[PDB]
Amino acid sequence: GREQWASRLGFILAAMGSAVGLGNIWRFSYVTGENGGAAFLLVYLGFIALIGIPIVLAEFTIGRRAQSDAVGSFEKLAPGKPWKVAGLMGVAAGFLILSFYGVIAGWILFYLFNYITGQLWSAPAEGFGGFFEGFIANPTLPLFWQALFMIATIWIVAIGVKKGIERSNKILMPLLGVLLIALAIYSLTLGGAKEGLAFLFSPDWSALKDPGVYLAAISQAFFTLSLGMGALITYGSYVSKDSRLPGAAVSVAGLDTAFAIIAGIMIFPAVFALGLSPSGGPGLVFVVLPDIFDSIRLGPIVGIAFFILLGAAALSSAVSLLEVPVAYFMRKFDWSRKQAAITLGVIITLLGIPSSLSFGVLGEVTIIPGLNIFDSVDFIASSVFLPLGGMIIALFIGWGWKTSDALAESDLTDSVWGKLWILSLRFIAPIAILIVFLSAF
Ligand SMILES: CCCCCCCCO[C@@H]1O[C@H](CO)[C@@H](O)[C@H](O)[C@H]1O
Numbered sequence: 001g002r003e004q005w006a007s008r009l010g011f012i013l014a015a016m017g018s019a020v021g022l023g024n025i026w027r028f029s030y031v032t033g034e035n036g037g038a039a040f041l042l043v044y045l046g047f048i049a050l051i052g053i054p055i056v057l058a059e060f061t062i063g064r065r066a067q068s069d070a071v072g073s074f075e076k077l078a079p080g081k082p083w084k085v086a087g088l089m090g091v092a093a094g095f096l097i098l099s100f101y102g103v104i105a106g107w108i109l110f111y112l113f114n115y116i117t118g119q120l121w122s123a124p125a126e127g128f129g130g131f132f133e134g135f136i137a138n139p140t141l142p143l144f145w146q147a148l149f150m151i152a153t154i155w156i157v158a159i160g161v162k163k164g165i166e167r168s169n170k171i172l173m174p175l176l177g178v179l180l181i182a183l184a185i186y187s188l189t190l191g192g193a194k195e196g197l198a199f200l201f202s203p204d205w206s207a208l209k210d211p212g213v214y215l216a217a218i219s220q221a222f223f224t225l226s227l228g229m230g231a232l233i234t235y236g237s238y239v240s241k242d243s244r245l246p247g248a249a250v251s252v253a254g255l256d257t258a259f260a261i262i263a264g265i266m267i268f269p270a271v272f273a274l275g276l277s278p279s280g281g282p283g284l285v286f287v288v289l290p291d292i293f294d295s296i297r298l299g300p301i302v303g304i305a306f307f308i309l310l311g312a313a314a315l316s317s318a319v320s321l322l323e324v325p326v327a328y329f330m331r332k333f334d335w336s337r338k339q340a341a342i343t344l345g346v347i348i349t350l351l352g353i354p355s356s357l358s359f360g361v362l363g364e365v366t367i368i369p370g371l372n373i374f375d376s377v378d379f380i381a382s383s384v385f386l387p388l389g390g391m392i393i394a395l396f397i398g399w400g401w402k403t404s405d406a407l408a409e410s411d412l413t414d415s416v417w418g419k420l421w422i423l424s425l426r427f428i429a430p431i432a433i434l435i436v437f438l439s440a441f
């Protein structure tokens with residue numbers, strides 16, 4: 001009845017495209033930065049091995065045995081039991097995260113437009129930092145480019161799994177990796193490599209007595225791995241009988257973390273050479289990356305190449321953010337695919353408009369005490385729904401699955417990995433999440 005990926009690799013690449021997006025470059029930079037660098041990074045790394053690798057496979061496992069959307073996946077496997085709250089919790093993180101995902105993806109298309117028209121080639125008068133300030137504070141200009149991005153996202157989603165989502169131009173994600181390695185090597189010769197690589201790889205332990213860093217790591221880890229958004233459950237619901245689930249979840253985190261690391265090697269050695277502070281808020285990369293391209297001879301070509309490849313990366317990730325409601329509403333309300341995309345994509349766009357305004361006119365306005373609207377949506381989405389959603393997901397398989405079924409559907413045997421993966425779901429990952437919950441609130 002449902003559409004499916006046309007090969008076992010098509011599922012891997014789509015999941016690779018879903019995972020590797022803006023949370024690798026943009027979000028990883030200013031979150032690693034404002035939380036102490038190397039202390040945070042080693043904690044974010046450790047969370048991906050013991051909380052990440054199991055839950056991605058947990059999501060992949062639950063995705064195909066039910067062959068349903070993220071919510072209906074819990075209704076066809078354990079009907080009547082209250083586990084569907086996790087499938088419900090993740091779709092809410094999809095509506096919330098795609099609202100400001102289109103906000104930051106609007107910044108991508110504006111900068112790309114400026115490099116195409118030859119505007120951001122040299123250092124503007126306002127400066128590479130000031131240019132970003134008067135742009136995110138302008139009430140309407142970010143909303144235009146967000147709507148333009150939400151078109152392609154909506155368009156691709158409305159096209160279909162086999163005619164749109166899976167048809168991602170196969171050679172573009174590798175082009176974004178090769179460039180980042182070439183961009184990482186460049187900033188290493190800007191005079192900030194010592195202050196950068198030390199702050200980014202050598203730990204300052206006193207930070208780990210602040211509990212926010214833990215929650216910050218768990219928030220970033222679940223966010224960069226497409227966890228707790230209902231996106232890995234649905235991408236698993238298009239996987240065929242013949243497929244190895246364990247190999248994909250590893251291939252995705254290894255690529256996402258490798259992409260995540262090179263971004264640190266590129267951003268932070270440049271932040272310390274530019275004399276800039278690593279805790280520069282969400283628009284950290286948009287102050288540094290143009291400042292780095294400004295010192296290259298062909299920097300305008302790099303900028304166009306960088307933002308075309310990073311834009312397509314944010315496009316391949318936000319398209320999957322829309323499938324979670326779309327694949328749900330087609331079942332729950334018999335909506336067609338094209339009707340679901342327009343309706344659910346234009347609402348997600350309007351939901352993010354108060355976030356784009358939180359950078360300028362709505363700066364002093366707060367919802368959650370102490371945070372502006374962008375930071376507040378980010379909190380409930382990425383620091384609550386994502387870490388708490390995976391806990392129920394992890395406890396769901398670990399406790400509410402017959403161990404013979406949990407390993408058979410996850411294509412794991414009774415090997416040490418099969419036990420370890422099961423072990424992390426039953427106890428390790430959920431308690432680490434539960435402990436970080438007790439220690440932050
Ligand atoms: C490419 C991998 C980089 C690994 C960086 C590990 C930590 C580097 O931090 C190092 O701390 C030392 C303290 O005096 C200094 O002498 C070094 O110059 C400094 O780079």
Ligand SMILES: CCCCCCCCO[C@@H]1O[C@H](CO)[C@@H](O)[C@H](O)[C@H]1O
Nearest residue numbers: 038042197198200201202203204205
């Ligand atoms: C290239 C990938 C490996 C990078 C390993 C990073 C090494 C961690 O950094 C270490 O931090 C310690 C202070 O806490 C210092 O005493 C060590 O000299 C330093 O190597």
Ligand SMILES: CCCCCCCCO[C@@H]1O[C@H](CO)[C@@H](O)[C@H](O)[C@H]1O
Nearest residue numbers: 179182183186295296297298301302
């Ligand atoms: C002092 C440095 C003056 C400019 C020397 C050019 C060296 C950088 O070279 C540039 O690096 C980019 C990747 O980083 C590539 O994409 C460009 O094609 C390449 O021209």
Ligand SMILES: CC[C@H](C)[C@H](N)C(=O)O
Nearest residue numbers: 019021022023224226317
């Ligand atoms: C919302 C997260 C998106 C889908 C992607 N996982 C990223 O790291 O940017």
Ligand code: NA
Nearest residue numbers: 017020313317
């Ligand atoms: Na992507």
Ligand code: NA
Nearest residue numbers: 019020021224
């Ligand atoms: Na990611």
